[PDB]
Write a protein that binds this ligand. Structure first.
Ligand SMILES: O=C1C(=O)N(Cc2cccc(O)c2)[C@H]2CNC[C@@H]2N1Cc1cccc(O)c1
Ligand SMILES: [Cl-]
Ligand SMILES: [Cl-]
Ligand SMILES: [Cl-]
Lengths: 99, 99
């Protein structure tokens, strides 16, 4: 699809068998999702936000659907204001910026 | 142009007679620039996300040139670690997400 930016670019994702709303965020290096259960071992990760740094949990090779497009990759879990699909997965689904 | 997301989508902007590097950020509602002088009245605002909030100065009707495209809108100025072009200006240059 082509998504304009007059409103927040919110889409539906599927992760852990559940539908969630998430923001397509080209300003985010990484994908971060609100607290939920994911399989496997995790590693620590620091995000640098506009207001400061924050530590989250990194899960690798997680299955996730974004607007119906299947992806498998790194998902961070922590206290994000909104679920964020960052560049790591935007690249997987072939998303570009155009003007 | 078409901009892939393998790396941060940084572009050159011209604002207030100055050249700066800024991030095209579809997850940002607003545009926020590091400390600099801008003309006109301003009012204080708080903007935030995963790492906390920062206090910024809101300037309205500011002309910017983003990667060669002129636009006008509100620009926030404050202690942001990265210059951010948000949706309020991305729309004006015709920027969309495509996949
Ligand atoms: O921390 C923030 C942040 O505060 N904002 C909000 C913001 C920032 C500037 C202006 C505005 O109106 C809103 C977000 C927006 N996209 C990534 C901005 N980030 C960075 C981020 C987020 C998640 C994962 C990452 O790897 C990086
Ligand atoms: Cl990944
Ligand atoms: Cl505006
Ligand atoms: Cl449009």
């Amino acid at each position: 699809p082509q998504i304009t930016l007059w409103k927040r670019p919110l889409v539906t994702i599927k992760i852990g068998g559940q539908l969630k709303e998430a923001l397509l965020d080209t300003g985010a290096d990484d994908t971060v999702i609100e607290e939920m259960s994911l399989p496997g071992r995790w590693k620590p990760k620091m995000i640098g936000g506009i207001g400061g740094f924050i530590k989250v949990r990194q899960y690798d090779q997680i299955i996730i659907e974004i607007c119906g497009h299947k992806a498998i990759g790194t998902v961070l879990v922590g206290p994000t204001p909104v679920n964020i699909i960052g560049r790591n997965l935007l690249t997987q689904i072939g998303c570009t910026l155009n003007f």
